[PDB]
Amino acid sequence: MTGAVCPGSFDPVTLGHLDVFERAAAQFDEVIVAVLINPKAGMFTVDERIEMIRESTADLPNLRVESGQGLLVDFVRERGLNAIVKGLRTGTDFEYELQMAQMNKHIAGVDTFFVATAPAYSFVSSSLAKEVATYGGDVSALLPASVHQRLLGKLRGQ
Amino acid sequence: MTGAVCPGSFDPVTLGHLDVFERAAAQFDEVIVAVLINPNKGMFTVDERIEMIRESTADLPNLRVESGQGLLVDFVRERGLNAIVKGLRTGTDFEYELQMAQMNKHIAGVDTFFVATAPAYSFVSSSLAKEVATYGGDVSALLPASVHQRLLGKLR
Amino acid sequence: MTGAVCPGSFDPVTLGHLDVFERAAAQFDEVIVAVLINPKAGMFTVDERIEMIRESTADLPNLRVESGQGLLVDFVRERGLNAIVKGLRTGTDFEYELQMAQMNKHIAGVDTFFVATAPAYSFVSSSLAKEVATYGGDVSALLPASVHQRLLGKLRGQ
Amino acid sequence: MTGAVCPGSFDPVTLGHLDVFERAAAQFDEVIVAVLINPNKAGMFTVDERIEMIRESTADLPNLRVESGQGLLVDFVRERGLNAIVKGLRTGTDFEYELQMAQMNKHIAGVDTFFVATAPAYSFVSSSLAKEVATYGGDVSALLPASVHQRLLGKLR
Amino acid sequence: MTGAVCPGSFDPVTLGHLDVFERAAAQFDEVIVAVLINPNKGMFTVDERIEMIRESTADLPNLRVESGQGLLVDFVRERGLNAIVKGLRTGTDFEYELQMAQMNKHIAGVDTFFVATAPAYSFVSSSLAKEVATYGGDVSALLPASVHQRLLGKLR
């Protein structure tokens, strides 16, 4: 009965995120992707972000996607789990991630496992992908095909 | 007669800060905790922050608490000192602290000494403590008792 | 059927290592502690290192201890697994750990999950503990009680 | 026909930036300083002021020119027939963010990024920290070119 | 006429090194790869290392390969240049590279430009490649073809 939670805002989900989802799903019996509700409203609504993740994780039967707000550790514990799996990329503020991990262990006994994303997906972030795409750069190799079309949709209607 | 200034916003003071204050007070004849007034906007007023620090440092007779505005090195030099003691924790932007230390030495001849807080208090920050408490997380092991009491009152 | 391998030389095992073992054992169905055979001979023989780990992990029923040499990924794969759990402490060469993790994923498809050890055990390493103990410093709070007595035994016979 | 672009907001240019400009000009046939403007956020100096301050402090570098732009840096670079960026490193540089941007810029446009550490003397100055210190009266005159220092004090007063 | 030196032991040259050589050769009129002779002890001789690099850089007409001993900045200045191009990868000790760059500028006026290797080649190093291959791991995607062939021969 093992399980982990993969948290983020995923605005939008990238192949970097998907890589981490896949590895978590391969090593734990159950995975929950936790989508942050946090009113800065990004580019996509929470429902849009959930849909894009669900579309991209259809081949992962033991993964589900749910939104949450408030403490991540509450999200995790209320589902009977006590592990978080967090991806590392180029540009990750790792010191802040370590601070949060130690706090989350202290207040709720939740462990955090870090995994580095694949080199190919190591320089994409949701923010940098949006920025580049806004100015006409090609990020199609860095996002799930579906996500990519939706992004083009939000820009070419702004 | 030696001396150092321990600067910060302390909104609120944490056990991480207190550990650093204690070590400064043990190693310098005089310590001044400098509480930043930033009119560009916290949870506690400057007077409340000063009072919380005084409560937590009651056993440190050579330490005093004062508010300050503007350039830290002016605050330091105006009190006849030229040393700053700054704590390090998990999540400290140390490269930025180093930049500021080298700047502060250049513009005023003020030295900065860094000390790592104890491992037990190394992941608390004023910001993260407030964030956790807001959502009902228990940070009472990470703050002085009087601070935790006031924090609950501000949220309730 | 989940599982992970916790690698190291463990010369000797510390409470930092034990903390990581406990977390791995709490989140995976099966854990193997892999003790490196690598002729620099340390302070303890491989058998001594294994014994000290077994003594300290008696309350972890799903953990076992085995020695290995050669590629870690071969050790992992030959046991039907493809995950490593590695602890982080103060003084960990994380950049080198990241390099090895990406190489190990490339050559064998093995994932590496990193977890930070508890703040209390974050400044102990096998090397620093031996060094301090050699010169008469008290490291009793940083090592399993058994390990501590064995260490005193190897120094007070040198 | 070698060449590189040295990008930044230069609000204002510092001696740390000039050090990097000088090194780039010594090592590439032509250097273009790219003054990158966010049309949605004003800084302290206007684009013409920024360019004037850079020109005045680079008059001894005959193979360097200064131009403004916005949008993608790699478009600015490729439109001038170049494909190299030279970026300085200082104390407080977010190097991981720079690396992320360098890898992204290579991926989307094939443009290379070369990093060079600025001289130790100029390694703790940044435009933002210089402005902050000067705002409260601190002496930053040794860290900025003459073309900048009193213009800065003028803005603040 | 611009130019730079790309230094290393290259024991053996990797695709990480080659990526950096290619970028240097694209941006400078002349590039010299400087192969370190260290009489304090590798797997390949200097002649073998030079030959492996030449095979891998056959398409780069403005790049040449030479061995060198002693101070890198002397090697650079003796060839009428004053720039070094050094690659960064995962596991690079960048603080030490920065120290050496500042030293090299101080003692000889030589600039050092750093470039990150491509993500695909970012975790290979000569040392880790040899270590993995010794135990039968497949690093053929990380080395030039001719290099991988020789490596197998040295181990067998």
Next chain:
Amino acid sequence: MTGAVCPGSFDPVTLGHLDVFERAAAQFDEVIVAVLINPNKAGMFTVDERIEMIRESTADLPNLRVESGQGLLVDFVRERGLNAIVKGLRTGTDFEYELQMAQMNKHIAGVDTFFVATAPAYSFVSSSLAKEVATYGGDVSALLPASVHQRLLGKLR
């Protein structure tokens, strides 16, 4: 009666070390430079040579003295009735290892460690890199005190 210990192997002392000594002496009533010796590995200079080179370059600091030792630094500190260490930071410092040692030293002996960044001008010198550069003829004379430079060249020849 404040005081601190400044530890190192000082083989040889550099201007980066002297900068730190000077700052410690300006901020503590007494400073002891601790020349820590490994009885199992000789360096370039003998302990008496190391101490002589430090004394000659610190003659203007009346509240500083120099002593050698071995074993645990915290024992050296506590035997002099002190409980503070002042350690310099430079480019290339393994800061994580220093932090590990500082936390261990607090744990086992209650001794505090204060870190200070050395001046930018002296931030890239280390004893080992100075020796390596000088070995192959590079000019390190601006990075070492006069008490050191020609003694170093003497050892190498």
